[PDB]
Amino acid sequence: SPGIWQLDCTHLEGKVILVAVHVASGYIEAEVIPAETGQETAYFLLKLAGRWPVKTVHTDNGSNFTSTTVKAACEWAGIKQEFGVIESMNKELKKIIGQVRDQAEHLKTAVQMAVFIHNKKRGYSAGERIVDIIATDIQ
Amino acid sequence: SSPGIWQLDCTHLEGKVILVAVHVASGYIEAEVIPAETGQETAYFLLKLAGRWPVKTVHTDNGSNFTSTTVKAACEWAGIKQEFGVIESMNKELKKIIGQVRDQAEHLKTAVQMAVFIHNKKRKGYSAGERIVDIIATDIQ
Numbered sequence: 001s002p003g004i005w006q007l008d009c010t011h012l013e014g015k016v017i018l019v020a021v022h023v024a025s026g027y028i029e030a031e032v033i034p035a036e037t038g039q040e041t042a043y044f045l046l047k048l049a050g051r052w053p054v055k056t057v058h059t060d061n062g063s064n065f066t067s068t069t070v071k072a073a074c075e076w077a078g079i080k081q082e083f084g085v086i087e088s089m090n091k092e093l094k095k096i097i098g099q100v101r102d103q104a105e106h107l108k109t110a111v112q113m114a115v116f117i118h119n120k121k122r123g124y125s126a127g128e129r130i131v132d133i134i135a136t137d138i139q
Numbered sequence: 140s141s142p143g144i145w146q147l148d149c150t151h152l153e154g155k156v157i158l159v160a161v162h163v164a165s166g167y168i169e170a171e172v173i174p175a176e177t178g179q180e181t182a183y184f185l186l187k188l189a190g191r192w193p194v195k196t197v198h199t200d201n202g203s204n205f206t207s208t209t210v211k212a213a214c215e216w217a218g219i220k221q222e223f224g225v226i227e228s229m230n231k232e233l234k235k236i237i238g239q240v241r242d243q244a245e246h247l248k249t250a251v252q253m254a255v256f257i258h259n260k261k262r263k264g265y266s267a268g269e270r271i272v273d274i275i276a277t278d279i280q
């Protein structure tokens with residue numbers, strides 16, 4: 001479905017990366033966060049929901065995802081949460097980060113470079129698929 | 140007019156800087172509260188924007204944070220064309236929504252993200268969020 005996203009956290013260089021994947025397209029949004037907290041997760045979801053049509057979010061049962069702050073943000077945004085593709089995206093994003101890591105001072109820059117590379121990679125790219133999927137659902 | 144052209148600007152609110160990006164053809168907005176009006180903050184914002192949407196051209200004023208070599212270098216890496224000098228009212232509308240929802244959040248960054256959500260979902264046939272994907276899908280063909 002065009003409104004389904006998978007979310008998870010991944011670790012790199014003793015830092016936390018919050019990753020969102022649009023399941024149907026492979027399009028990703030990622031951010032380096034100071035810690036895996038409900039406040040960081042809620043803020044990320046609120047940004048994501050204002051940018052794309054977010055209908056359902058699939059996560060695991062980690063405390064940052066089951067947090068009442070997150071539940072309340074989803075209730076405000078009209079998002080359905082479901083607990084218990086993102087497994088491989090973690091590896092691919094980590095591969096691209098490793099490839100460009102020495103081109104940036106900060107890990108957050110390397111992460112945003114990796115998101116750009118991933119989403120533009122073409123014969124459609126993930127960035128083209130997501131808008132094609134969503135535009136057809138609007139008819 | 141084109142699906143890859145964005146207008147960027149800085150606004151101030153409560154002693155903080157808000158960087159606002161408007162997709163000119165749709166009225167779609169992306170905004171973030173930044174700790175300081177610097178080339179580094181502006182470059183980082185553009186890098187995130189360019190990885191999320193097709194960004195071909197960025198129109199800004201001649202502010203030092205936009206004329207910065209860090210921003211010029213980030214645009215060069217991303218293949219973005221920079222151009223300097225109704226979207227003047229976008230800062231006013233965003234500030235209007237921010238003011239309406241301000242007491243519903245502790246942090247200004249939250250109120251800004253609530254305002255972006257409200258603005259992009261607003262129908263009064265199509266919303267800005269629908270128009271951006273429709274304009275970009277049309278040009279993909």
Ligand SMILES: Cc1nc2cc(-c3ccccc3)nn2c(-c2cc(F)c3c(c2C)CCCO3)c1[C@H](OC(C)(C)C)C(=O)O
Nearest residue numbers: 103104105106109113179180182183186208209212213216
């Ligand atoms: C700290 C820092 N200083 C500087 C300085 C100059 C720079 C480069 C050429 C001429 C003049 C200045 N660029 N530049 C960058 C910079 C900015 C980008 F947008 C970017 C890239 C990088 C390396 C790589 C390609 C993708 O885009 C940074 C990065 O940090 C932030 C993103 C700012 C938080 C960093 O992590 O190194």
Ligand SMILES: Cc1nc2cc(-c3ccccc3)nn2c(-c2cc(F)c3c(c2C)CCCO3)c1[C@H](OC(C)(C)C)C(=O)O
Nearest residue numbers: 039040042043046068069072073076243244245246249253
């Ligand atoms: C600090 C803070 N604490 C809390 C606590 C609870 C909360 C709400 C209901 C039950 C249990 C806890 N929510 N909540 C929020 C919160 C989170 C949202 F995603 C959000 C909204 C807000 C108010 C409003 C509607 C839009 O979505 C925040 C906000 O801060 C961050 C975004 C986290 C950085 C804030 O600035 O107030």
